[PDB]
Amino acid sequence: QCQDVVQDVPNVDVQMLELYDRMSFKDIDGGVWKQGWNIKYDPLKYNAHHKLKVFVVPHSHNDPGWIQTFEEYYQHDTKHILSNALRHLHDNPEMKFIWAEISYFARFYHDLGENKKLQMKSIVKNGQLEFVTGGWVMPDEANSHWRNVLLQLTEGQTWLKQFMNVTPTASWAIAPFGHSPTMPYILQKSGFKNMLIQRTHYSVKKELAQQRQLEFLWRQIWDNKGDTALFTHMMPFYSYDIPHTCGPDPKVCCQFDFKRMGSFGLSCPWKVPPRTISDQNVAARSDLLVDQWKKKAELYRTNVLLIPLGDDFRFKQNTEWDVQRVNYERLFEHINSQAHFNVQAQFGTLQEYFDAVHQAERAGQAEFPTLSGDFFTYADRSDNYWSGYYTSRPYHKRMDRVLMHYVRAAEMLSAWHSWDGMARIEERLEQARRELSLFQHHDGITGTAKTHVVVDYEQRMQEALKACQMVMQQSVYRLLTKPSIYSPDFSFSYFTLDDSRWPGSGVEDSRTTIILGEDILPSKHVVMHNTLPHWREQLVDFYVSSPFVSVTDLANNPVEAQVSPVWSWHHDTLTKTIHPQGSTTKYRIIFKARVPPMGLATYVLTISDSKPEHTSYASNLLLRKNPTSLPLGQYPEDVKFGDPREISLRVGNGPTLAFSEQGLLKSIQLTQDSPHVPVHFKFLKYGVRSHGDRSGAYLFLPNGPASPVELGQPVVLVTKGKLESSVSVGLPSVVHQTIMRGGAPEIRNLVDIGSLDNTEIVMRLETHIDSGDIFYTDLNGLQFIKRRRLDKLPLQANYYPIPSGMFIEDANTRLTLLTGQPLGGSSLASGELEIMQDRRLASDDERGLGQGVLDNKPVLHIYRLVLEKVNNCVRPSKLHPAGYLTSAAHKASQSLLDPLDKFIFAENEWIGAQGQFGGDHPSAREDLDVSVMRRLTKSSAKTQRVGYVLHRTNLMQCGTPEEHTQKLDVCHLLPNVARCERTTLTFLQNLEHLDGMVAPEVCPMETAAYVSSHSS
Ligand SMILES: CO[C@@H]1O[C@H](CO[C@H]2O[C@H](CS)[C@@H](O)[C@H](O)[C@@H]2O)[C@@H](O)[C@H](O[C@H]2O[C@H](CO)[C@@H](O)[C@H](O)[C@@H]2O)[C@@H]1O
Ligand SMILES: [Zn+2]
């Protein structure tokens, strides 16, 4: 019996949307704890029979790229930190240290000699060095897709299991800029028992501290029973550095950071330095320190206190290890010996802290509150909300989503077979997983790194894309060639990938033309891959060197096709207009590909001397005053011209779209009879303040509501075809395109902010929909959370991450915008949606980056726009904190994130070609996905193992019967199954041995992992 994720509102002690509605968010001076209050404690609370247990946990925050590249930091800092940790921990058995970033640890460990590897394993086994989380990175939680959060977690933990024989069950996330419930969701399904967070809004820290609700059982917003709950510790103060981790007064705590006495080039901003601990000062020093600890302890419910001891790239110098250790040892010896303190203090690890907290809990000493919700948008002080990084460096945010899909497709396509080592499949896939995993870092996908570091991430991701292409095309060639003919050269390109949306038209001329001709080559095979576990039809397009091309399947059945020109937009620096030019030698052919679940389908493109029977030609209409001619070579339809005017289009029996004379949507009519529902696209601009704090890579600090972009009299191009129609317009900084293929439109924006300094370009949708102050945005592509616009907070506080979609609705109507890239957005007034496209900022925003954002480059953003009637849908109650997509919106999101892959055969003739793969694969219910298929064993293993991650979303019931689908049992996808086991999501622990070797499908909103074992 599945939990109902719609109709049962969970009863939790703290529900973050409710808390937000009630809180005042006043920013008052609290004294030494600037954002809190003067903490008081009863000195008699602790006595001989009830002592305060203090764990001082040394740590070093190591960014895998930020102000330097990964490799620069490794050479200049991290390799020294790890080498000196090994020495100092070895030599000082009571000293402890925690480590989070496995990318660096793997980088270090593989360069060690065997003697040192053994010493390292010994300090891990004995518990002195403890891994926390164990992901490749400490990821961003706002822009990251859940699939990539899982990918990087798995990459780090798989390394740790293999080399260190440990799997962390406690997570440490001190640095991401706000926190998502997607983390406890994944962690709890990956064996975790505890997690720690830090960067939450200062007003939230104060509110929860006042109620001693900083430790809580964090469950998902829809979880009525609580089975998703994960114990979470929120740190109370402004920073994770030493001045903000000993207690509420940083002027005091800074005196206990022994790296700040002068020789290290560090000091205390509060103007009182640390002093070396001696017998003559230890009593006074201890009195000050214990007083800070007892104040911090007032904020929590047990007698066990966590004191982190660290900062960025700490514990480098041998002298630094000594200065911190020897001074703390003198403090501990004094404090622990003076009964009047009633304290036992020691170095500890994160797990030791949590174990002691839960021991106290079981002793009946505390009960913990339940909580649901998220912790966006973060503000660290005053009105400084960190909503800028939801958009910064949008080219690379888009690249993340492209690479996400290519990693999935490469792992899936190659999983079907075992490969010889000489094929280098495992090598290429490990590289691709690791570069994508690295980019999940909270300075990677966030767009908060220095320019040269962004370039490094981009180069790494480009290499990863090439690796995925190589693995994919080798796999296609194996899956579709007669086995007794197959003769692979593992270095050769049998196919090249054709991608219509990355980097994109107008971004890079990267696509190959299929060159056909009577005197060269009459025809070409192309292959589509469908990574989703259901049959899919989708229009696909290729560039071809003639308009006279027709399409067949590999039974030689004709397939209806449409040919259109190849249009490119040019900023004519002579005429000062932006206008399209057509190619006279290449054309686009478009046709519907029908592809099996997790399968492949082959088609053939053939040239003829004249218009083929089954190919039609789009009309083209250029709307502008003072047109000039647009010749198109052999294209059989002449371009038409007109003055700008409103126009309407309808493809198939789908919606009718109306456009303004400037080429922007104005209305959607769902059916023949229905109203033309106002739905109006508009581009606006935000600026930057001329006084006070400046927007930068992290912060969005607008100088008021956005102002309309002045459009002039833009050139509009209308292409009308039987299969696909479009309206494209060259606006200042944006070539905006609305594409119609018979269902929800697709929007593409080619965004080039050029040299517009101190500008943020936003795309807004204006409707009539009576949404009031409510809107919905997603978290990590996993779930939709209810948002309430709060006029008591500034504009930038009402911006949230849009990692994959957002919607507004009233009783009758919903408008959903799905995205192919994470961007920031909001609903700033009833009936509106808006999403930021790019931002160019001249100033640094005082968070450590030390530059503006002046490295913008053209990016092609993609979207789907779904207007729907929802009066018949079974929706959650008004008090439920979640929302859910319809079938059409979810399919539209899948169309953006996991499109069909397209392969063009490279050579002239493909001997032994086959027409299809996977025609016998089950076509699963629309709400179920095989998020991951990964072969886990190399070819030398007697018993092959294949891992699957299944995810089931939850779609609204709206009265569409949508019938008969087949059960998907992933354990029988490969033959000769000998065992099927449910595992943690990282595949690292077996949870259940499955009867009949059958992997059951999962419940709505659940994710499960299975591993099948095969004897042949
Ligand atoms: C809030 O500013 C923070 O400053 C530190 C600078 O750290 C270095 O100087 C300090 C102060 S004397 C030393 O004690 C340290 O050991 C270092 O040498 C930044 O490194 C820190 O960065 C963190 O937050 C930013 C966002 O503000 C992230 O982008 C980054 O990933 C990191 O987590 C911060 O700038
Ligand atoms: Zn960091």
UniProtKB/Swiss-Prot annotation:
Catalytic activity field: N(4)-{beta-D-GlcNAc-(1->2)-alpha-D-Man-(1->3)-[alpha-D-Man-(1->3)-[alpha-D-Man-(1->6)]-alpha-D-Man-(1->6)]-beta-D-Man-(1->4)-beta-D-GlcNAc-(1->4)-beta-D-GlcNAc}-L-asparaginyl-[protein] + 2 H2O = 2 alpha-D-mannopyranose + an N(4)-{beta-D-GlcNAc-(1->2)-alpha-D-Man-(1->3)-[alpha-D-Man-(1->6)]-beta-D-Man-(1->4)-beta-D-GlcNAc-(1->4)-beta-D-GlcNAc}-L-asparaginyl-[protein]
Enzyme Commission number: 3.2.1.114
Keyword annotations from UniProtKB, A to Z: Disulfide bond, Glycosidase, Golgi apparatus, Hydrolase, Membrane, Metal-binding, Signal-anchor, Transmembrane, Transmembrane helix, Zinc
Cofactor(s) annotated in UniProt: Zn(2+)
Xref: Gene3D superfamilies: 2.60.40.1360, Glycoside hydrolase 38, N terminal domain, Glycoside hydrolase family 38, central domain, Golgi alpha-mannosidase II, Golgi alpha-mannosidase II, domain 4
Pathway membership, UniProt: Protein modification; protein glycosylation
Induction: Inhibited by swainsonine and by copper sulfate.
Active-site residues, Swiss-Prot/TrEMBL: 175
Side of membrane Lumenal, spans: 1-1016
Cofactor note: Binds 1 zinc ion per subunit.
InterPro entries noted in UniProt: AManII_C (IPR041566), Gal_mutarotase_sf_dom (IPR011013), Glyco_hydro/deAcase_b/a-brl (IPR011330), Glyco_hydro_38_C (IPR011682), Glyco_hydro_38_cen (IPR015341), Glyco_hydro_38_cen_sf (IPR037094), Glyco_hydro_38_N (IPR000602), Glyco_hydro_38_N_sf (IPR027291)
A biological process from GO: mannose metabolic process
Membrane-topology annotation of the record: Single-pass type II membrane protein
Pfam families named among the record's database cross-references: Alpha-mann_mid, Glyc_hyd_38C_2, Glyco_hydro_38C, Glyco_hydro_38N, Laman-like_dom
CDD domains per UniProt: GH38N_AMII_GMII_SfManIII_like
GO cellular component term, pick one: Golgi membrane
Ligand binding (Zn(2+)): 61, 63, 175, 442
UniProt-annotated location(s): Golgi apparatus membrane
A single MF term (Gene Ontology): alpha-mannosidase activity
Protein family: Belongs to the glycosyl hydrolase 38 family.
Function: Catalyzes the first committed step in the biosynthesis of complex N-glycans. It controls conversion of high mannose to complex N-glycans; the final hydrolytic step in the N-glycan maturation pathway.
Subunit structure: Homodimer; disulfide-linked.
Name assigned to this protein: Alpha-mannosidase 2
Source organism of the structure: Drosophila melanogaster (Fruit fly)
